[PDB]
Design a binder for this molecule. Structure first.
Ligand SMILES: C=CCNC1=C2C[C@@H](C)C[C@H](OC)[C@H](O)[C@H](C)/C=C(\C)[C@@H](OC(N)=O)[C@@H](OC)/C=C/C=C(/C)C(=O)NC(=C(C)C1=O)C2=O
Ligand SMILES: C=CCNC1=C2C[C@@H](C)C[C@H](OC)[C@H](O)[C@H](C)/C=C(\C)[C@@H](OC(N)=O)[C@@H](OC)/C=C/C=C(/C)C(=O)NC(=C(C)C1=O)C2=O
Ligand SMILES: [Cl-]
Ligand SMILES: [Cl-]
Lengths: 213, 213
């Protein structure tokens, strides 16, 4: 059973701006997702300074990107802290975010969309490039859940009986728009990582499917 | 809940021979799995000659190999016909197989283990290289199930709430033995495919994880 939740009204309004935007530097979505992944990795590592047990659900600390061209999907996985059900509900849409209005007011004054991570709302940049997202997450303190949104006014949260087990962490599953299929390509991906994600403390893995010739 | 089933006695005896064998040409396990994958692909394609609907759960016809080095696992996936629960139970261990005794009698006369596919029992060759297998399968006619064995006298079958959805087909998940970790390596894999699987009608995909430098 899927519980449904309403987005706070300014978040809806923010996704609607970003979804319907001509902006020409959309690659920054990947800088934001990598940077969030790194934040989550920092938190599990930090937590484990005084609780080493927390690392054992998933000893390896990594960021992994998996294009799925046949489904038009790009997945960004991390083994960071993960989010519980209550965390997905509170933090991904139901409660007002501090920088949402301020970011939109800056945008309409001329600010580059790039500044979105500085306003602390950079997760919503994934709608530049995607018209649907699943956030699949496994916190040490809860079962695996799927949060899903298509940028309308509500999102669902659902106990995960459908995807592979994460030992610990999060998978951002993006349903790319038809004009944004360039982020399915290996060359394009490495290039965006080189430009925007030079200083990442964690290995960044790219999963590539080759045909044997 | 996992139902448990008993292997027919000669199948147990066959796995026990293969598990405990010095034989020096174990790579043939991959020839057998690829060839089984191709058999399953033939059957779905054939079925769909008079029922094109059957293809739509998974339009693409492929064999995909995914080493998972960190788990010491090798997965062989196909989008073939898949097997229902009853098929996994009947065909993977509970009923006597025609070539089981005859293959063992040949083995003890001097036959190469390679002849195993000729006796129609080549699936059990995966125990040359693995001490545990999951067969995860999705037939158009049933839900996704996991069959599991560790070469003892019984196996389990379990409704799958734990792995990614197959649209249609089968994943052979092999828990490699510590001395057989060479089949985790890309170079080794392509080499075994070149030698034994030259004439396969279907694309063979290798999934490779690279670190971005
Ligand atoms: C205020 C600083 C504290 N951290 C941050 C917060 C506030 C809280 C949400 C923190 C979270 O609370 C449970 C968690 O601690 C984890 C670690 C979540 C992640 C960082 C993210 O994913 C993973 N797991 O890869 C991400 O969703 C996938 C979250 C997106 C959230 C919003 C909306 C966002 O756009 N930007 C935010 C960033 C960037 C933050 O760093 C942000 O809001
Ligand atoms: C007698 C000729 C008919 N086909 C074969 C049979 C008899 C039946 C089992 C057929 C099956 O019935 C439901 C199915 O029709 C599908 C197609 C199953 C696959 C071919 C296999 O996997 C996929 N899906 O990749 C494989 O398990 C993973 C099966 C292993 C079975 C045994 C034990 C074996 O060692 N060798 C066999 C081979 C090779 C056969 O071709 C075999 O026994
Ligand atoms: Cl806030
Ligand atoms: Cl038979």
């Amino acid at each position: 059973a899927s519980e449904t939740f309403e987005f706070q009204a300014e978040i809806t309004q923010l996704m609607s701006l970003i979804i319907n935007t001509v902006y020409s530097n959309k690659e920054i979505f990947l800088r934001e997702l990598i940077s969030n992944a790194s934040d989550a990795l920092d938190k599990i590592r930090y937590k484990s300074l005084s609780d080493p047990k927390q690392l054992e659900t998933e000893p390896d600390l990594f960021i992994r990107i998996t294009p799925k061209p046949e489904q038009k999907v790009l997945e960004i996985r991390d083994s960071g802290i993960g989010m519980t059900k209550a965390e997905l509900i509170n933090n991904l849409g139901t409660i007002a975010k501090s920088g949402t209005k301020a970011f939109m007011e800056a945008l309409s004054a001329g600010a580059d969309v790039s500044m979105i991570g500085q306003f602390g709302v950079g997760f919503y940049s994934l709608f530049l490039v995607a018209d649907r997202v699943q956030v699949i997450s496994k916190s040490n303190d809860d079962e695996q859940y799927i949060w899903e949104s298509n940028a309308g006014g509500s999102f669902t949260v659902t106990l995960d009986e459908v995807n592979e087990r994460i030992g610990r962490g999060t998978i951002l599953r993006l349903f790319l728009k038809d004009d944004q299929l360039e982020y399915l390509e290996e060359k394009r991906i490495k290039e965006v990582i080189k430009r925007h994600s030079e200083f990442v403390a964690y290995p960044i893995q790219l999963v590539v499917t080759k045909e044997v010739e």
